[PDB]
Design an enzyme around this catalytic site. Structure first.
Site, short mmCIF file in Angstrom:
data_model
loop_
_atom_site.label_atom_id
_atom_site.label_comp_id
_atom_site.label_asym_id
_atom_site.label_seq_id
_atom_site.Cartn_x
_atom_site.Cartn_y
_atom_site.Cartn_z
N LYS B 42 -5.82 -2.95 2.60
CA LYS B 42 -7.15 -3.53 2.50
C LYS B 42 -7.55 -4.30 3.73
CE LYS B 42 -8.42 -2.19 -1.55
NZ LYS B 42 -7.22 -1.90 -2.31
N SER B 269 1.68 1.41 -6.92
CA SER B 269 0.75 2.48 -6.59
C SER B 269 1.30 3.39 -5.50
CB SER B 269 -0.61 1.91 -6.20
OG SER B 269 -0.50 0.94 -5.17
#
Lengths: 299, 299
Positions: B42, B269
């Protein structure tokens, strides 16, 4: 092309970032050693000490690593033993972070519980001696492959990314390998007479007390990763130009400042290293000199 | 030379590592996006969304960022707002990790408490509308500077480090920007017809159900960072070649395996993304094809 064969080979090439709210007009730049496998500088020596024991034949298939976990050195060795398929056994005291427990046990480590840090050292040794042919101890405070990986990677990265302009290298001392290997790279292999600055806690200033011929008085402190309370064999005193002491509260406050004002997350020992550099950086003596500071870990 | 002017510019150039206990004879390689400022992918979009709003003049000195914290997007924006001197306000629910609280508040964030994740979205909006001239919302699920930074950096890094050999790119979908921008870089700017594979939780397979014309049935799951339960506007369906579903337990088990067997610490993830790639990797169809998998975070 540039695909590492395992995670151990991916160590390093950590970045240089200029500090805005420290030093004098941008003369303090930091090397973010947290941008590393296992999120600390120790990944460099965990890889290279394993690598060198393989070259030595002191470490081969089926031999089991044993090491007294120096918090971060345990994580780095753990991830390397897993990346290269070695069984590993680490020793550290009775508690510490139950997150460090779950992480080490998550990394496939066999963990051993001792009752302080001189105490943990013992049960590794009696485990190695329990069967000297199954177990290897890497000995991070004295293993020359610790400073050697910094002379081969960390120093040269600093030399290349600063185009030779680096004038001062500021680094805290736990095992001493980082400042020894860096300083060796820049002074001896590249030939520039930089100012090598060791940082130690003011609460345990054994390097300062030693060099001054004063009584060596180790003491408790909160700056994790530095201040072992003795002169490590991997710290080459002959190459230290200067020693700077920092207190725990300043070291902590500096770490907070690096976050809130620079957007840099670093441990308290990076705060100590930055506080020391900022002190130098605001001496006119160092006004026109590029200072590079090691930030050894994330948190 | 190579000194970043602030921490935001240091995003990226994350490494490729070949997996030994996954795939078929080394055809699965991973991109470790955790080797990033703020320890996740991110950081790339937090920087670029701030950067682009500056180019836009939608963000200037004294304007205060507001954003609904998508766990990791809040940390990345936080460290960038601090690195560039913006006040920031993030909104996220009532609890989450009290470590995430201390970190965000440590990064100088002003944090806002809401009562689920659709609920947190609201109090950001009524804060922005409380004074539209002091506040900017970046909107990570629809802001084109999210996929654009991946088309400009993440994709090209994959292209250069694989010397064009990358055949498959496997990536989980939260906002969809990573696979969109990567796939756009490699298919459209470089001209290779790779297989773009989205990964979603089998417990909430809205991309699969949508593309199949079936009832869209979002559901609870444990794979943090992906599976938003809807089709984001930053996910370009036109460029997805294939969708793979993974369950939470397999995604978790895979994350554990990456640690214990590869020495790679990654979030659940990344475990989901690796499980999906390993599935492809062991189809003869993909036996002689280089598969690159995004590992989005550390833990």
């Amino acid at each position: 092309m540039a695909i590492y064969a395992d995670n151990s080979y991916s160590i390093g090439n950590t970045p240089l970032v200029r500090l805005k709210h420290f030093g004098h007009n941008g003369n303090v730049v930091v090397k973010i050693e947290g941008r590393n496998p296992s999120y600390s500088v120790k990944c460099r020596i965990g890889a290279n000490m394993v690598w060198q024991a393989e070259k030595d034949g002191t470490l081969t298939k089926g031999k089991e690593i044993v090491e007294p976990t120096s918090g971060n050195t345990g994580i780095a060795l753990a991830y390397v033993a897993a990346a290269r398929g070695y069984k590993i056994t680490l020793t550290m005291p009775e508690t510490m972070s139950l997150e460090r427990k779950r992480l080490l046990c998550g990394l496939g480590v066999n963990l051993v519980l001792t009752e302080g840090m001189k105490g943990a050292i013992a049960k590794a040794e009696e485990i190695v001696a329990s069967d000297p042919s199954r177990y290897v101890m890497l000995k991070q405070f004295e293993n020359p492959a610790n400073p050697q990986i910094h002379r081969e990677t960390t120093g040269p990265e600093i030399w290349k990314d600063t185009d030779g302009k680096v004038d001062v290298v500021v680094a805290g001392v736990g095992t001493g390998g980082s400042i020894t290997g860096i300083s060796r790279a820049i002074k001896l292999d590249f030939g520039k007479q930089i100012t090598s600055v060791a940082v130690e806690p003011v609460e345990s200033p054994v390097i300062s007390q030693t060099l001054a011929g004063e009584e060596v008085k180790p003491g408790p402190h909160k700056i994790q990763g530095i201040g072992a309370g003795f002169i490590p064999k991997n710290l080459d005193l002959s190459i230290i130009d200067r020693v700077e002491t920092v207190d725990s509260d300043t070291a902590l406050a500096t770490a907070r400042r690096l976050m809130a004002e620079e957007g840099i997350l670093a441990g308290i020992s990076s705060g100590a290293a930055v506080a020391a550099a900022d002190r130098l950086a605001k001496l006119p003596e160092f006004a026109d000199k590029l200072i590079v500071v090691i930030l050894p870990s994330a948190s």
